[PDB]
Ligand binder design. Structure first.
Ligand SMILES: [Cl-]
Ligand SMILES: [Cl-]
Ligand SMILES: [Cl-]
Ligand SMILES: [Cl-]
Ligand SMILES: [Cl-]
Ligand SMILES: [Cl-]
Ligand SMILES: [Mg+2]
Ligand SMILES: [Mg+2]
Ligand SMILES: [Mg+2]
Ligand SMILES: [Mg+2]
Ligand SMILES: [Mg+2]
Ligand SMILES: [Mg+2]
Ligand SMILES: [Mg+2]
Ligand SMILES: [Mg+2]
Ligand SMILES: [Mg+2]
Ligand SMILES: [Mg+2]
Ligand SMILES: [Mg+2]
Ligand SMILES: [Mg+2]
Ligand SMILES: [Mg+2]
Ligand SMILES: [Mg+2]
Ligand SMILES: [Mg+2]
Ligand SMILES: [Mg+2]
Ligand SMILES: [Mg+2]
Ligand SMILES: [Mg+2]
Ligand SMILES: [Mg+2]
Ligand SMILES: [Mg+2]
Ligand SMILES: [Mg+2]
Ligand SMILES: [Zn+2]
Ligand SMILES: [Zn+2]
Ligand SMILES: [Zn+2]
Ligand SMILES: [Zn+2]
Ligand SMILES: [Zn+2]
Ligand SMILES: [Zn+2]
Lengths: 329, 323, 329, 323, 329, 323
């Protein structure tokens, strides 16, 4: 029965102090996870035109840049290897190579910065000639259970390299449980699995596929037989429920802003650690507008606050350093 | 979600600080902290309080000195509690609405000097009555409801005139929020916030505040046994126009905080009262508990859903948080 | 649509009789469980400076004091042995020694007072040199499943001694199910398991670690890799759900006052027998204030009524005798 | 929570008295018990009631004698039911508001003598009408709603003037709670509680009370079939200002108690009516049921969510509880 | 926002037609199940003083009386044998005797009235010398799992006799699942199990124990280690959930009127076929009052309507014939 | 509840008629059936309706003849629909409130003769307007809301004066329930029930009724697409004082019935409209469906939560139920 003029919702908005007192959500640097593109080789830095301000870095350069991310208090990185063209195959075997970019980078960072969280990407897409997330059958379909076998091998290799978190981004059915049972069997008791539970078949991923070099491989291919239809919301709940039952420690929605309603439903329904990826296309859209002078730089913290408001525990964001810098000030 | 060991091991996210930080559900910040402060009549005076180790009654000039650091630390607001000279107490509680009473003077001083600092005044007769009850007594010793409201209304208007951004009725009369709000609106004070003490219990935990300000209540304060009743109290105060609602005491009533936040989704505050402070500080000084119990106690309120916390630990907490 | 002045919530507060009629919760002595510190030896009584008014008692002295607890109608005791320094080890073997303090005390009390409930503590912390609740690996981490093996042995020894309730306070994952399956297999059909389900990594435990003599062992060590983060509420629901699925008969939240919101959520969510521990630091805070004249002794029953109000079925409290005495009057 | 045998054996907590006590969800206490009592016009008189074995109509002086033990036992309140002399009945029910009617006299006597004892008066015309209906009849024999309310209002004010702390309208007219509350407020009786009989059914279980007080109703009392309707009845009475709400009869309507408590979280009472008492006592005296069924019947009400219970067993129960 | 005088709840009560239009529940004879006490022998009829108007009947007499119950459209009977004293034993073997009263009566009635439902009682109490529902251990405790073994045998014997429904009234943990697995294994695919799920340790059963002749056996014994505490409501939900998971087709609350809040919660929570027993003490109380002229006979249909209102699908009631007769008129 | 085959076989309870009867969730009875009837102006006249096979428009004397059997069968109420002579139609719809209009005459006749039979009158202008819209038209052809209400109010009062126990506004003007209820209360008709057609859709299923009574509406009747909107319609009608609420059409809107019952727990009715009847009867007469589809259709409404059903099958159903 709250009614104007007895209730005037502007009163608490009248002054900064009262806005601070009634503020429902506060972003902190504990919320930020930085994705990073990792090159092979030494002393390599490469700009990405469709992700202004982000560079692909060789491992040596990554370790230098990480000093600052650690100093800013960024809790974790999510690694994305930029696989050389020659290491792509039909069998995706590079995925489980102990000397692959991801495994080498993990061992280097685990050594150098023991408190920094490392989240490796469990997916075959960086490793396939065709750019799909799994192994194809003779009809061109991404086979579910054969792909899981490879994913398992990959996840184990990551655990062996020391990754504290493996994040399967593949959208195969059942892979969380398969990976978890493999980790348990092998004694990797405490390796976290951060499931990409509700990962949509989106147009927002284009810049990332440029950054990692899978755009050329995928071409005009699509992923509608495994990634979720953008139209579907209830389905995301079923996806998350399975992954929690299968042993996920964290669950993720991807993409992010375009799916904030999904974040809120998933947090409300399961009350579990819930993450969201502000993907490459989201970063690119915002950057582009900022550098054109169309949007003020304040939009960065507004975009991130939205995820917090929608119920996210943490956010994978290419803005993590920028944001950490602003928050610290 | 059919989560089962060993597929689900809840300790995995606990393994490392980074993952604990990622999955952490609540983070206290200085934005959460409101400092109560006991205000004396004089100049260049401070007094120690036997039952509130570490807390000083401060004359207004001393308040303004300390307020420098409070503001520097980012503490958003203060809650003022005047220490009324005994000569100013009466059966009619008229001192409550004296334009040059302590609270009014303190408010004007602080408003002018630290314009961004929130000032929350106490609307209650208890510092002004010779008997220390929160309202006016009838011949049987009963606290009169509606008679008391009339005084409280004049009080609240006097605070608005002094410049308070928030008035906080702590009296537990029925209907007082509506009466106060209708008086503020009619006077043109359309942005003065009302922070209702909605679910304020008849508690043993207030002993030390009575030492601090120099002052039974079961016919107006709530029975500690009752939880559902708190929801009806809050409902009425929101309908009557409260901008924020408060539970008092605090840690002994964390269940009430959570139910109030869950039920109404409105700005909800909690008071970590004098006895809660005293217990904690006493145990800390005795060496029985680590200093860490201060931030743990305050994290509890955030976890229970509080938007902000009235706490005598506000400065110490703000300091620790800034490290 | 209840509105002043038609609705005046003070009317029922006007008189004692009406306050009694509308009172939502009434504490009784059926709510009180007394923790007690048990020494080895004979005719031993020791004060604890950080728990004024509580004594550690040898078994003979415990049996004498128990006559009065039984007379007051206190339903159960929770036993906490004060392990001699020389019986602490890396392997915690004393935990399952049939001639350990807990097992001896249980057999004595089961004999002397057959109707009195005995709740033994299932944890390795009193028995380890390092004071952690489980067995350490070579990185200093408390190993989950190896610790459970010891806990199991301990629980069985307690059942063998006649304890009606075993209460695992260890916070290892899965231990309720492991203990339950062991009890069932061994024919201990009716031994209750009172899980410490939501047990937080708290500062409020200091006096107890003084009382049992584990403070020196633990030193500055912490338990954040197993006990819960104070910040977390939803997580407590997941903890409780697992322990009910695993066969707990009762579930507990610890500490108590600082976590009353957890008590209420757990009762509301599961509608199961829910207990709360008013821990040593809580007792010490209140006692200290009472003996300084800062708080009236009425605070004791107010503190206990809060647990009842928050939904607790029973309360582990060092005030149990004091409170029983007051209630009886 | 996926609880499954044999990991979960619900009998474990049942194994021992101590564990049954630990997990026990509800405990009846004397605080729950309100004693109805039938009050005669005379002096030094008691009468037995054929259909309520063990229950005596009591003149006021005898009431005051018995009230000593009731108070000693801790029984919080009585609910008075006058046994009106036939010569005082009329079509206008004016005896209802007679300042020296039985209920008014009894109230004043008890208020003065046992000031802490709660007195709940019955607001209804049925003891005062020649026809025994709860309201005034029109020419077709229909109980007039609004005309009846006017009488009930005068009745309730007469009880407030006599000192009753609680008035309990048992008439089942629409809107009567609001009318009564607006009359009490306007007269200054701001703390007189109203215990509404909110969901009172058209029941066969009232036969023995009509023998007791010396007196069909389907156009005002509720149809036993209806559950949802009870929620609408209660909702209106809370909005109209009831301090407590009541379901009557009691055990045959335990489902309604539970729904009412769950829906509104308000102070909820239940009447274990004359027929419920008579059935139980008859079976106990016949040797067909053990005396233990008294406390079992009353435990049912607590379990269903009742705050308090109007029961003719109140003294026997209080005695058993005190052992 | 419904408010007087716009809303006057009496308007629909003004006339019979409108009361009928808004009436929420209507009892019908499809709701009534008749319990019946069965004697051994021929041409035997015995009154029961504590259940006025009810007779124990030998099988021949039962078949005669059943013609009228069938004609009235009573859907089912619940049989309760009156076991001869000499057939009571420690092992309860009479429970599974193919020539026991229950098995003989079932075969007779299945033959004579093929459409009439027969619900047999699965419990050891009619068959034990001590009157407890199960087999005692050497401490006098009713053993759970050993009792189930006997119950299983009994249930199978009933299925063999042709009973369409077996109703375990024993309150052993897990017995629904054990019985169901036995029935399935033996090919009794369609034998229904009507679980007494929430059966309370009540004083209301005295007349029945007179009627079946177990009062003398039980004496002053109690059943608090298996039947539910009257105080407990949430516990009933846990009891029902287990029995549905274990394969019950119907669930029952007993006693009835004193537990109507339980009926409503169970229906609301599970939305499953829910039954309630108006027990012997309930019948006796009402009869006694009716025959004393204290209550009108209308109380019978009022009592039964309450069960319907509280959500019961059907009611076990000794008033079934009386009520069927009234409804038919 | 983790129920799983083969431990759970849902067919077990289906095995036998007795167990199907035990577990049956809903039972239709004659108490559920309200018969709509088309009433002609004359004497000794009946007319057949091409699009409603089997249904006869009846003059009042013929209505009274048939009402004998309806009452004998236990049918609780009728809903009257007059067949207005074309000469009595107008732009102002004044015939609606004519004291000797068909509906008024029929009501008085039936009230006097069958005093226990409920009579539900139709409050709408559509039988009285030359254009057949449910309200008064403006110059653009729009149905005026508030102007129309004034007419409907006079109509409803005329029905109350004639003795109708229930008036049923079928017009879908906003606010009409409140206006009607305030007029009935002010006139002293305090027990006249209002059966609101709350969620009445702009439907193709009404074609045959327009043939029957001898008469687009998307600016007042609801869009068939909308479900949530029905809840807002019902909410308003309950607040405005409706005693019962109705969904129309019926089977095509069973989802709405269920949501309305679940949301409000109030007396909820449904109209199995002319087109639903015609479809069913046509298919039955063609031999395409068995007669059993009548009781199946009506069982659907009970299952969806309806308290009662307006259905042209009422007599046939009542007959079948009585066998
Ligand atoms: Cl936040
Ligand atoms: Cl690991
Ligand atoms: Cl209680
Ligand atoms: Cl055991
Ligand atoms: Cl029904
Ligand atoms: Cl079968
Ligand atoms: Mg998936
Ligand atoms: Mg959150
Ligand atoms: Mg976070
Ligand atoms: Mg100075
Ligand atoms: Mg209030
Ligand atoms: Mg919040
Ligand atoms: Mg805040
Ligand atoms: Mg756990
Ligand atoms: Mg409880
Ligand atoms: Mg308890
Ligand atoms: Mg005398
Ligand atoms: Mg009413
Ligand atoms: Mg309660
Ligand atoms: Mg009570
Ligand atoms: Mg069971
Ligand atoms: Mg039903
Ligand atoms: Mg049925
Ligand atoms: Mg004729
Ligand atoms: Mg409308
Ligand atoms: Mg219904
Ligand atoms: Mg109906
Ligand atoms: Zn991929
Ligand atoms: Zn005050
Ligand atoms: Zn431990
Ligand atoms: Zn009456
Ligand atoms: Zn039995
Ligand atoms: Zn119309």
């Amino acid at each position: 029965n709250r009614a104007y003029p007895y209730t005037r919702l502007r009163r608490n908005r009248r002054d900064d102090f009262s806005r601070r007192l009634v503020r429902e959500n506060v972003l902190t640097v504990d919320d930020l996870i930085l994705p990073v593109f990792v090159l092979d080789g030494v002393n390599q830095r490469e700009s990405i035109p469709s992700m202004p301000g982000v560079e692909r870095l060789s491992i040596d350069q990554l370790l230098i840049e990480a000093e600052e991310w650690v100093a800013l208090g960024i809790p974790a990185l999510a690694l994305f290897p930029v696989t050389p063209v020659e290491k792509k195959s039909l069998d995706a075997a590079e995925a489980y190579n102990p000397e692959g970019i991801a495994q080498r980078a993990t061992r280097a960072l685990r050594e150098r910065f023991p408190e920094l969280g490392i989240i490796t990407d469990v997916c075959l897409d960086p490793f396939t000639t065709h750019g799909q997330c799994g192994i194809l059958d003779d009809d061109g379909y991404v086979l579910n259970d054969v792909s899981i076998d490879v994913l398992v091998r990959q996840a184990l290799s990551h655990a062996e390299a020391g990754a504290q978190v493996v994040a399967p981004s593949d959208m195969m059915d059942g892979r969380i449980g398969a990976i978890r049972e493999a980790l348990e069997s092998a004694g990797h008791t405490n390796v976290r699995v951060m499931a990409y539970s509700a990962k949509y078949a989106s147009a927002y991923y284009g810049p990332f596929r440029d950054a990692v070099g899978s755009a050329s491989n995928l071409g005009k291919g699509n992923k509608a037989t495994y990634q979720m239809d953008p139209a579907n919301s209830d389905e995301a709940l079923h996806e998350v429920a399975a992954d929690l039952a299968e042993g996920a420690d964290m669950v993720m929605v991807k993409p992010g802003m375009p799916y904030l309603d999904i974040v809120r439903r998933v947090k409300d329904e399961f009350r579990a650690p819930t993450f969201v990826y502000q993907v490459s296309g989201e970063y690119a859209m915002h950057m582009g507008a900022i550098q054109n002078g169309w949007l003020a730089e304040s939009v960065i913290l507004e975009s991130l606050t939205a995820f917090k408001r929608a119920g996210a525990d943490g956010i994978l964001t290419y803005f993590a350093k920028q944001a950490a810098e602003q928050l610290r000030r």
